[PDB]
Amino acid sequence: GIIRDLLIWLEGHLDQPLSLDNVAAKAGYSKWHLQRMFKDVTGHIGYIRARRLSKSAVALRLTARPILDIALQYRFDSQQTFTRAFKKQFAQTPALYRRSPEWSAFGIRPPLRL
DNA sequence: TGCATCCGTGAGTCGAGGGTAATAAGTTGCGAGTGAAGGTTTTGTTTTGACATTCAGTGCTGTC
C-alpha cells in the first residue's frame, strides 16, 4: 500500500535533490526494509540508477547542452562514473550515441508505470 | 662717434567648415618569399583484466 508515493516523485526527483537510499529512507521506513517492500511489488529500487541514466538521456538527444553538464545534472558522480554506468548499460560511448543519427531502445531502462 | 645691417617680441579662452596638387621607359632574368597544400607528429579524448570499497539486491530475524 504505502510506498506508491516513491514511484513518480522519483520521476520528478532524480534532479537537484541528491537522493541516496538514506535520503530514500526519508520515505518513512528504514534502509533495509524499503528494499523488499519495493521488491515484491516490482521485481526489480536503487531502477533509480536507470532513471538517472534514462533521465540523463533526455539531455543528450533532446537538449543542445554538451556532455559535461549531463554527468553532474542528474546526480551521477563524475564523467567517467557516468560513462562507467553508460558502457555497462548501453555499451556505447555517449559521444558515439548522440552523434549517431539513429537511436533505438537497446539499453534505456523504462520507467516503472507498474 | 656714427652707419647700417640684421635680430626678434606684439594678451587670453571657446567655436569653423575640410582641403591639394607637376612629372617621368621599357625588357630581362632570377632570387627571396605569401600561399595553398603531404598528412604525420606531441597532446585532447575513448574501454578492459581486476580489488578495497560503497552499496543495493537477496533473505533473515526481532520486536511490539
UniProtKB/Swiss-Prot annotation:
Residues 21-42, 67-90 bind DNA. Residues 4-100 form the HTH araC/xylS-type domain. Transcriptional regulator. Binds to the right arm of the replication origin oriC of the chromosome. Rob binding may influence the formation of the nucleoprotein structure, required for oriC function in the initiation of replication. This is Right origin-binding protein. It comes from Escherichia coli (strain K12). The gene is rob. The chain holds residues 5 to 120 of 289 of the full protein.
